[PDB]
């Protein structure tokens, strides 16, 4: 009933915890909970929808006013208009949402498998001893760019080299 919605909702609350931001997500959840909690309290509040003209008409001596308000109740048996009012806007918003959802989903699925491939590539070929430094130049011309820039600069100090590889010095 309401419990299917609310179990799935709260399961999503602790799932939404996983993602970041929810400053106005929670206001949406609050609204759906609020009004859902209102309608159940309404439905529990409920009186019978027509007079008990069994007891309370046979008490009354002032006849045919019970028949009046009976006819007034049976008149207003048609309550008022109701429809799916969000039926164009709910489909539009969810469509837009769905587009975004599929976009994120496809993106992360792609990225996941890319990360698997990279993880596998570092595992199946891990250079940490040898592999030509010429090959490191071949896989990255960033090497030659920096080397050329350093030679052009006329600086043979490489900063960063010193902070994780010592310097042999006699001073």
């Amino acid at each position: 009933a309401k419990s299917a919605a609310n179990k799935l909702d709260w399961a999503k609350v602790i799932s939404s915890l996983r993602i970041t931001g929810s400053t106005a997500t929670q206001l949406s959840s609050f609204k759906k909970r609020n009004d859902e909690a209102r309608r159940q309290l309404l439905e529990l509040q409920s009186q019978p929808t027509e007079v008990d003209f069994s007891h309370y008409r046979s008490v009354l001596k002032n006849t045919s006013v019970i028949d009046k308000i009976e006819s007034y109740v049976k008149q207003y048996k048609p309550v008022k208009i109701d429809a799916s009012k969000q039926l164009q806007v709910i489909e539009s918003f969810e469509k837009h949402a769905m587009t975004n959802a599929k976009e994120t989903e496809s993106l992360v699925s792609k990225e996941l498998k890319d990360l698997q491939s990279t993880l596998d590539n570092i595992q199946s070929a891990r250079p940490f001893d040898e592999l030509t430094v010429d090959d490191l130049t071949k896989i990255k011309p960033e090497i030659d760019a920096k080397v050329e820039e350093m030679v052009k600069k006329g600086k043979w100090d490489v900063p960063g080299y010193k902070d994780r590889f010592g310097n042999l010095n006699v001073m």
Binding site: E36, R38, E43, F93
Partner: protein, 52 residues
């Protein structure tokens, strides 16, 4: 990085279910408004009959 990615992955599909469900629930509350108005009218009718 895979860990970050995995969180987003599972969320991305499943959230659409709740998105729909929550709005669907709000539709049910519209129909509940009609209930409230029935309840009200009846309660009032009973009250007057008691006053008589």
């Amino acid at each position: 990085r895979i860990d970050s990615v995995s969180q987003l992955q599972n969320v991305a599909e499943t959230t659409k279910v709740l998105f729909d469900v929550s709005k669907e629930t709000v539709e049910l509350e519209s129909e509940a408004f009609e209930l409230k108005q029935k309840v009200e009218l009846a309660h009032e009718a009973k009250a007057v009959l008691d006053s008589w």
